[PDB]
Amino acid sequence: ITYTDCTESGQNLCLCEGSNVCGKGNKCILGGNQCVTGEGTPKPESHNNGDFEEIPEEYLQ
Amino acid sequence: GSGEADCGLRPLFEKKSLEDKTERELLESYIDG
Amino acid sequence: IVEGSDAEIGMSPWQVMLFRKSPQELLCGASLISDRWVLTAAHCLLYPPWDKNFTENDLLVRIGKHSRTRYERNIEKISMLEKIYIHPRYNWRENLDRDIALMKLKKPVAFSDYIHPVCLPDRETAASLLQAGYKGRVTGWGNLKETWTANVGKGQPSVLQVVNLPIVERPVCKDSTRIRITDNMFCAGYKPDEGKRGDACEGDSGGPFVMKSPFNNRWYQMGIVSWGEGCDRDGKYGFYTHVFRLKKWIQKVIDQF
Numbered sequence A: 001i002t003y004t005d006c007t008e009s010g011q012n013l014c015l016c017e018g019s020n021v022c023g024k025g026n027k028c029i030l031g032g033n034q035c036v037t038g039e040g041t042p043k044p045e046s047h048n049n050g051d052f053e054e055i056p057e058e059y060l061q
Numbered sequence B: 001g002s003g004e005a006d007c008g009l010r011p012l013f014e015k016k017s018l019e020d021k022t023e024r025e026l027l028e029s030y031i032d033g
Numbered sequence C: 001i002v003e004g005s006d007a008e009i010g011m012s013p014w015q016v017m018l019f020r021k022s023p024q025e026l027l028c029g030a031s032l033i034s035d036r037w038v039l040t041a042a043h044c045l046l047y048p049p050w051d052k053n054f055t056e057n058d059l060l061v062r063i064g065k066h067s068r069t070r071y072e073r074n075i076e077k078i079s080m081l082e083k084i085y086i087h088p089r090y091n092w093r094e095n096l097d098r099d100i101a102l103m104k105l106k107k108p109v110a111f112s113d114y115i116h117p118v119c120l121p122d123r124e125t126a127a128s129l130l131q132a133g134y135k136g137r138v139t140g141w142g143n144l145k146e147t148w149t150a151n152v153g154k155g156q157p158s159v160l161q162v163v164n165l166p167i168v169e170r171p172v173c174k175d176s177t178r179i180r181i182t183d184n185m186f187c188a189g190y191k192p193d194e195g196k197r198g199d200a201c202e203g204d205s206g207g208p209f210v211m212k213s214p215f216n217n218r219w220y221q222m223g224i225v226s227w228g229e230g231c232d233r234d235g236k237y238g239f240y241t242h243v244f245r246l247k248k249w250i251q252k253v254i255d256q257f
């Protein structure tokens, strides 16, 4: 799990104040930025790759 | 191996008496570095 | 891996790729501990925050790989999972405390030049080797950098990367985060004034943190890439799951004798 910067206001599970995560039960105010009390939404999981060569489909089943 | 298997010995390295390019770095960390 | 280099063929024969079947994607790293057992991070399989909860059937294990994306035909071994095991006290509920898991292969893998297990340490190895200042080695196919300018190059390596990092004194690990650090964790990475850098990053998680014993020439798995607050930030540290400390769990699940 790598926590990266909050992208939208009200996201949690991301870097809000500096290199500090804004945890569950908090939400990020893209101001300075503020990590606030409140139910945020976790910045969504990034998908980093996708240029894979073909593996035998016997395994893809 | 015998009882405990032959873990952590690479065939292409330790088994051929060859060192990987940055192992030394790990080794000296121990005697300071 | 951030500021690492290309691994040499067979340099980390225990490195495993956790591969998503549909859509095809690299989930995380792992390690081979025997011809049937794979060690990974619990968050790679179960992480409610991202509604991540994979089954044995959602994933494949790719072993003996150098290349991130090629299908290494007479070298890599692709295996199906028989069962998964998550540590029962794994606190995803923001701690990632006890972030460990085991995967059992449907069939045992044949070892080779590019496939061979690493060693789990004993107490005296763990006592000898886990010292602040000593260096461990991290490997993976994760991101080259925390963030980059989109569509200008690729932030993912074409080949497995390796980086050597020093273990940091706990008080310092502790003072670098606002998160509550447990006994089941340790942190590694250079100090800001230290003048070197490198870290694990997205896609490297689940992977092995290894140390080599000079006395017997053996590679031992001391950690599992668990979490960090960014990748390679100054005054920030990569956090590893403390393997020695959870070996009684491992012992209990494998039930070898």
Ligand SMILES: *[C@H]1O[C@H](CO)[C@@H](O)[C@H](O)[C@H]1NC(C)=O
Pocket (backbone or CB within 6 Å): C046, C048, C053
């Ligand atoms: C799958 O099992 C995990 C184990 O705790 C649970 O947290 C998760 O909510 C489950 N997913 C489903 C199908 O709701």
